[PDB]
């Protein structure tokens, strides 16, 4: 089915119908007027961040380059390979940018301290893919630029997702969601799921341990908040 979209639900409604039972939802009307939504053009990103070093996932390999280099080589003109400025705490590195986002009020329903929320940037061209995996905290994934196709499988379906057997990769599925090898992974075909296209100004709540797969449909910038 499709992930439900709710306009500014109350704290109590979010807590009781989504957070506690662990059900995904898209929050509308919450981040849609954060400054980032209008300010973060490529040129703005170059002006504020261009000379800073960032980690870039290529393909598979992990490298380092400036933001200006990342934009030149992997975004504009005609890139040779897929590169993704993924899972990077850009807002700790560049506090000016932190002024363009906010901590969602819903995070205060958690048990953790605000100081310990991890804020990551996800900036890349059309076609970046984060394979199906699960994380150990709650997440608000805020879409700023472009759209993402997202598939969500409940932790109750873990047996059908064939996690990798190493402790290191045990949080990641062996299956390629959009082209699954059903000869090797036959249980995957019948596993139920939710999906959405997440658009600018929308927030996706990914419950703790919910399996998620993400493909960028356009040049994309997302900001995740990992919280408890
Ligand atoms: O947006 C992506 O490509 C991955 C999002 C990530 O898995 C998260 O935990 O926020
Ligand atoms: Mn994740």
From Swiss-Prot:
<feature type="binding site">
    <location>
        <position position="133"/>
    </location>
    <ligand>
        <name>Fe cation</name>
    </ligand>
</feature>
<protein>
    <recommendedName>
        <fullName>Bifunctional peptidase and arginyl-hydroxylase JMJD5</fullName>
        <ecNumber>1.14.11.73</ecNumber>
        <ecNumber>3.4.-.-</ecNumber>
    </recommendedName>
</protein>
<feature type="binding site">
    <location>
        <position position="133"/>
    </location>
    <ligand>
        <name>2-oxoglutarate</name>
    </ligand>
</feature>
<dbReference type="GO" id="GO:0045893">
    <property type="term" value="P:positive regulation of DNA-templated transcription"/>
</dbReference>
<keyword id="KW-0560">Oxidoreductase</keyword>
<feature type="binding site">
    <location>
        <position position="135"/>
    </location>
    <ligand>
        <name>Fe cation</name>
    </ligand>
</feature>
<dbReference type="GO" id="GO:0005694">
    <property type="term" value="C:chromosome"/>
</dbReference>
<feature type="binding site">
    <location>
        <position position="87"/>
    </location>
    <ligand>
        <name>a protein</name>
    </ligand>
</feature>
<dbReference type="GO" id="GO:0031648">
    <property type="term" value="P:protein destabilization"/>
</dbReference>
<feature type="binding site">
    <location>
        <position position="148"/>
    </location>
    <ligand>
        <name>2-oxoglutarate</name>
    </ligand>
</feature>
<feature type="binding site">
    <location>
        <position position="87"/>
    </location>
    <ligand>
        <name>a protein</name>
    </ligand>
</feature>
<keyword id="KW-0805">Transcription regulation</keyword>
<dbReference type="GO" id="GO:0046872">
    <property type="term" value="F:metal ion binding"/>
</dbReference>
<comment type="function">
    <text>Bifunctional enzyme that acts both as an endopeptidase and 2-oxoglutarate-dependent monooxygenase. Endopeptidase that cleaves histones N-terminal tails at the carboxyl side of methylated arginine or lysine residues, to generate 'tailless nucleosomes', which may trigger transcription elongation. Preferentially recognizes and cleaves monomethylated and dimethylated arginine residues of histones H2, H3 and H4. After initial cleavage, continues to digest histones tails via its aminopeptidase activity.</text>
</comment>
<dbReference type="GO" id="GO:0005654">
    <property type="term" value="C:nucleoplasm"/>
</dbReference>
<keyword id="KW-0031">Aminopeptidase</keyword>
<dbReference type="GO" id="GO:0006508">
    <property type="term" value="P:proteolysis"/>
</dbReference>
<keyword id="KW-0156">Chromatin regulator</keyword>
<dbReference type="GO" id="GO:0003682">
    <property type="term" value="F:chromatin binding"/>
</dbReference>
<dbReference type="GO" id="GO:0004175">
    <property type="term" value="F:endopeptidase activity"/>
</dbReference>
<keyword id="KW-0131">Cell cycle</keyword>
<dbReference type="GO" id="GO:0001701">
    <property type="term" value="P:in utero embryonic development"/>
</dbReference>
<dbReference type="GO" id="GO:0045892">
    <property type="term" value="P:negative regulation of DNA-templated transcription"/>
</dbReference>
<comment type="subunit">
    <text>Can form homodimers (via JmjC domain). Found in a complex with RCCD1. Interacts (via N-terminus) with RCCD1 (via N-terminus); this interaction stimulates H3K36me3 and H3K36me2 demethylation. Interacts (via JmjC domain) with H3C1. Interacts with FBXL3 and PSMD2. Interacts with CRY1 in a FBXL3-dependent manner.</text>
</comment>
<dbReference type="GO" id="GO:1901796">
    <property type="term" value="P:regulation of signal transduction by p53 class mediator"/>
</dbReference>
<dbReference type="GO" id="GO:0032922">
    <property type="term" value="P:circadian regulation of gene expression"/>
</dbReference>
<feature type="binding site">
    <location>
        <position position="212"/>
    </location>
    <ligand>
        <name>2-oxoglutarate</name>
    </ligand>
</feature>
<keyword id="KW-0479">Metal-binding</keyword>
<dbReference type="GO" id="GO:0051864">
    <property type="term" value="F:histone H3K36 demethylase activity"/>
</dbReference>
<feature type="domain" description="JmjC">
    <location>
        <begin position="83"/>
        <end position="228"/>
    </location>
</feature>
<keyword id="KW-0090">Biological rhythms</keyword>
<keyword id="KW-0539">Nucleus</keyword>
<dbReference type="GO" id="GO:0004177">
    <property type="term" value="F:aminopeptidase activity"/>
</dbReference>
<dbReference type="GO" id="GO:0048144">
    <property type="term" value="P:fibroblast proliferation"/>
</dbReference>
<feature type="binding site">
    <location>
        <position position="57"/>
    </location>
    <ligand>
        <name>a protein</name>
    </ligand>
</feature>
<dbReference type="GO" id="GO:0005829">
    <property type="term" value="C:cytosol"/>
</dbReference>
<feature type="binding site">
    <location>
        <position position="212"/>
    </location>
    <ligand>
        <name>Fe cation</name>
    </ligand>
</feature>
<feature type="binding site">
    <location>
        <position position="130"/>
    </location>
    <ligand>
        <name>a protein</name>
    </ligand>
</feature>
<feature type="binding site">
    <location>
        <position position="84"/>
    </location>
    <ligand>
        <name>2-oxoglutarate</name>
    </ligand>
</feature>
<keyword id="KW-0408">Iron</keyword>
<feature type="binding site">
    <location>
        <position position="139"/>
    </location>
    <ligand>
        <name>2-oxoglutarate</name>
    </ligand>
</feature>
<keyword id="KW-0223">Dioxygenase</keyword>
């Amino acid at each position: 089915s499709t992930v439900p979209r709710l306009h500014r639900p109350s704290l109590q409604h979010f807590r009781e119908q989504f957070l506690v039972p662990g059900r995904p939802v898209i929050l509308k009307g919450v981040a849609d007027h954060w400054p980032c939504m209008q300010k973060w053009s490529l040129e703005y990103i170059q002006e504020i961040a261009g000379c800073r070093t960032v980690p870039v996932e290529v393909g598979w390999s992990q490298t380092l380059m400036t933001v200006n280099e990342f934009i030149s080589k992997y975004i504009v003109n005609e890139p040779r390979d897929v590169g993704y400025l993924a899972q990077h705490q850009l807002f700790d590195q560049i506090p000016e940018l932190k002024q363009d986002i906010s901590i969602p009020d819903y995070c205060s329903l958690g048990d953790g301290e605000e100081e310990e929320i991890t804020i990551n940037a996800w900036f890349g061209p059309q076609g970046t893919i984060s394979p199906l995996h699960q994380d150990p905290q709650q997440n608000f994934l805020v879409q700023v630029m472009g759209r993402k196709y997202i598939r969500l499988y409940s932790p109750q379906e873990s047996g059908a997702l064939y996690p990798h057997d190493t402790h290191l990769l045990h949080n990641t599925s062996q299956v390629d969601v959009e082209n699954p090898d059903l000869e090797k992974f036959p249980k995957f075909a019948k596993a139920p799921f939710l999906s959405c296209i997440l658009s600018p100004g929308e927030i996706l709540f990914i419950p703790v341990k919910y399996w998620h797969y993400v493909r960028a449909l356009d040049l994309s910038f997302s900001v995740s908040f990992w919280w408890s």
